[PDB]
Amino acid sequence: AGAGGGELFATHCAGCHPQGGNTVIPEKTLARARREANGIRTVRDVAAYIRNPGPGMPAFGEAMIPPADALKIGEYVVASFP
Ligand code: HEM
């Protein structure tokens, strides 16, 4: 609906990744070096990951996070979590 990546992140992601952390599996934060060690480097990598993520994270399909919104989330993640 034209929401920005940060707003989408606050709604859908920050309940388990507040400030880019991880409240479920603490080592698995969004910090750049950590996520990139598991292959999550680009905007598109983030957008694809949320469709089929690791255990303990729900999948986010296109009905709840449309493709354009998934890319905006990816942009936010890459920009915000060094
Ligand atoms: C919201 C859409 C959202 C995003 C974006 C997101 C991202 C994300 C990444 C990039 C990782 C790192 C994976 C890696 O292997 O390094 C990651 C990992 C986990 N997440 Fe997440 N996440 C989003 C949402 C949520 C929500 C709402 C939860 C909690 C219910 C959650 C949880 C987790 C867990 C657990 C992991 C670790 C998975 C693993 O392989 O061990 N995420 N997330």
Residue numbers in the entry: 23 to 104
Quote the original article:
OmcF is a 104 amino acids protein with a predicted small lipid anchor at the N-terminus formed by the first 19 residues, a soluble domain consisting of residues 20–104 and a low-spin c-type heme group with axial His-Met coordination.
The protonatable site of the imidazole ring of histidine 47 (His47) has been hypothesized as the redox-Bohr center based: (i) on the typical pKa value for a histidine side chain and (ii) on its spatial location near the heme in the structure of OmcF. To test this hypothesis, in the present work, we used site-directed mutagenesis to replace the His47 by isoleucine (OmcFH47I) and phenylalanine (OmcFH47F) residues. In both cases, the side chain of the substituting residues is not protonatable and, therefore, will permit the evaluation of the contribution of His47 to the observed redox-Bohr effect. In addition, the crystal structure of the OmcFH47I mutant was determined. The crystal structure of OmcFH47I mutant determined at a high resolution also showed that the mutation did not affect the structure. The global folding of the mutants was assessed by NMR spectroscopy and the comparison of the polypeptide and heme NMR signals showed that both the mutants were properly folded and that only local conformational changes were observed in the vicinity of the mutated residue regions. Electrochemical cyclic voltammetry studies carried out for both the mutants, within the physiological pH range, showed that the redox potential values and the redox-Bohr effect were smaller compared to the wild-type cytochrome. This unequivocally confirms the role of His47 in the pH modulation of the OmcF heme redox potential and electron/proton transfer mechanisms. However, the redox-Bohr effect was not fully abolished in the mutants (approximately 30% less in the mutants) suggesting the existence of another redox-Bohr center in OmcF, which was attributed to the heme propionate P13. Therefore, these two acid–base groups with pKa in the physiological range (heme propionate P13 and His47) contribute to the overall observed redox-Bohr effect.
